[PDB]
């Protein structure tokens, strides 16, 4: 019964106050008396007449501030040094038992909050530290985070005022979780969840958010963590396959150094998703100015080829893993506006498309991810900035930008360029034009729904001396003109980019690529002129090579079977160009079907 | 009375135009109501025939593999 | 090479033509292409004022097999309307007088539908197809209005039947039963624009940070 | 003057219900004009969906 607990509680507490008013024996006596009193306090019940009020044991304890005075009586014994990390763990276990086990919400009271705040200062002594003490500290902080997450009004009550005018306040619930974010295992994960809960509570409070964004060093800790973890990554990608173009799930989990970076970036992504806007802007600016500019700025410009491949693959993985638009704005502004050796970073990445190796494949995958983000600014800076002034068209054909290929002139013009060697003489590649029409329908519909938030339609009205279509168009067409010399996996991503770019519903971009009846100024190279040059070169290889119809049959039957299993210079040139004769007519089917589906899209989308 | 007959004449012409706009508004509302009833009935029969054809459409909608190039690009990541 | 993809060209041309029919606004004209044939467009006009007021005329648009390099599309009615330009035994409207030559990229099928609506708002008697309708037009107008009212009742009485051309996409009216048709009407009216559409799954999210009217990136104010 | 007052009362009531009829005509016209866009779009969206479905079915059948 609850009254007998009161008598035996004043029995132990009377022994304890006597011990304070009069060393190892007294310390052991107050430790087991403390254990008994706090286990009895964990099993207090409220009075049934007033269950919303505190119980009688809390009424006796909080009246004279029992917990804080016995805690500071042990902390003045802490200066001896005998059993410091055992006694600290003992009080950690005791106050964790009050936070978890007690059926009343104890934290609404002042004195127990002050006792917990003094205990958090007692555990704030500097390193070295036994791992049991860190485990108990993280567990106590996590349980306190859970309790304050259930009662959100006490985050300002834990924000205790500065001890000096102009000094920083001491939120001991948050600042003690700051060194434990980078730790691995269960302990660092518990610290990350507890800090995420605190940041969710600080989303609804302007005083705590201004404290974290202005009087706490959490954002430099995160920025220096990302900067230090971008030194432990390998500068060499050791993957044996030649079809590898980007870091897969099996790849970045296979490198333990990269997994720590990926977990840290996921934590930063969640913090940017959740926390307060002042805190969000502080972490945005600190992540930018302390990770991207000082580290990733020089790291992309590493001259050696394999370091370039590694940096481009890491950049593509990071752009593929941000979900929040605020951190994505940071990454994309860093890519689009930061200038090194008087050149844009995006210009440097454009210049790496025209390369002869795995660097080209990772660059095409990076630009595939960039165009798959469906952002305005990348597509604008790549092509549309050069297509807004509309100088590539002569003076009398400027209305032809807005025309729509209703009757299939463009599909006929593209399908007329299919080579005579590849045409079926009087094997699933003979009549699959319906399947290209389906994926052109989902291709245009995806690029229409993802452009609904865009500022301008780019229809030619809203908004060198000879016209120039931009360094992205010149490099992409010149690499497309070399389609015989390129690899089969390079051509797969290169035709993947042009098909994905032609699905954009912008009439300035669509008329430049798919409107075949457009004639341009002589300095401008169209997509039709480039594909015509490939058509001439693939037929010249046809007449000069003897074994070609037998080589077409075996190279085709491999390419279906890859979808089902889901002296060197002459041998390489033969192998690439025979592969090019399987891609090019069905690249021609893909560009035809996209130009068909642009005349079909509903008014009830845009 | 010569003033009275002219004033009641323009009063009766006012009533004449009132009756003309009355019957015109009645005809307009009746046609719009019947037209909307016809449209909703046609769409409802249309949709019920679509759910009757859904017994075939639940088998016809099955299909995968996409285009050859998209399947090949997605199969490039399989080592 | 060209002959292997001709059905694709013609058929997607007719698909784009129905899309551009949806583009242009037509008062009371509700057009639908057929299921079984690609060259048949069913439909129905509602004549909102004029001499043919409260008239409901079903039709069927016949598209030539070599569109657009061919003739004007042929338009017939389900029931022959007493009009100077409607065939009294077949129901074919004389569409070819206005569209004498089908010029490529100029004429479209929505212009045929617009002329079909406009022929009931401007009666022309020059060189007809039903001569008694013409000579009732410029001589004895009240008998013409009586015969218009009678033909409107004849057309209205045959609306609810099994239609002339059997098709899974044939326009078939039902008698007004409010218990399910009110659910159908609220299923009309609860639909809205694709802004905030019901597809809230699958994060198809675009990004933009340019101030409108400007061409420089990252000019949108924070 | 009493007869003139009576027919002017009847006249003012006539233009009063004229304004009432014109207000009801304009409100019904604007309601039907707003309603026409929604009924036309709800017809033509499903019409274009059925046209695309029959379109791909026919184009699959011809091969």
Residue numbers in the entry:
A (entry chain C): 32 to 53, 62 to 465, 545 to 581, 733 to 835, 914 to 953
B (entry chain A): 627 to 705
C (entry chain D): 66 to 287
D (entry chain B): 627 to 689
Tell me, in the authors' exact words, what the paper reports.
Cellular cargos move bidirectionally on microtubules by recruiting opposite polarity motors dynein and kinesin. Here we show that kinesin-3 KIF1C acts as both an activator and a processivity factor for dynein, using in vitro reconstitutions of human proteins. Unlike other cargo adapters, HOOKs form a stable assembly with two other accessory factors, FTS and FHIP. We provide a structural model for the autoinhibited FTS–HOOK3–FHIP1B (an FHF complex) and explain how KIF1C relieves it.
Our 3.2 Å reconstruction of full-length FTS and FHIP1B in complex with a C-terminal HOOK3 fragment (residues 571–718) allowed an atomic model to be built for each subunit. In the absence of HOOK3 the complex between FTS and FHIP1B does not form, suggesting that HOOK3 is central to FHF assembly. Our structure reveals HOOK3’s interactions involve the last of its four coiled-coil domains (CC4) and a C-terminal extension (CTE), consisting of a flexible region followed by a single alpha helix (residues 694–702). The first contact point (site 1) involves one of HOOK3’s two CTEs, with the helix latching onto a hydrophobic pocket within FHIP1B. Site 2 comprises a span of HOOK3 CC4 residues (653–688), packing tightly against the catalytically dead E2 ubiquitin ligase domain in FTS. At site 3, the opposite side of HOOK3 CC4 (spanning residues 663–670) binds a C-terminal alpha helix on FTS. This helix is situated within a long loop (FTS ‘belt’) that wraps around HOOK3 before docking into at the midzone of FHIP1B. Instead, the opposing face of FHIP1B comprises a highly conserved patch of surface-exposed residues. AlphaFold2 (AF) suggests this is a binding site for small G-protein Rab5, which has been shown to link FHF to early endosomes.
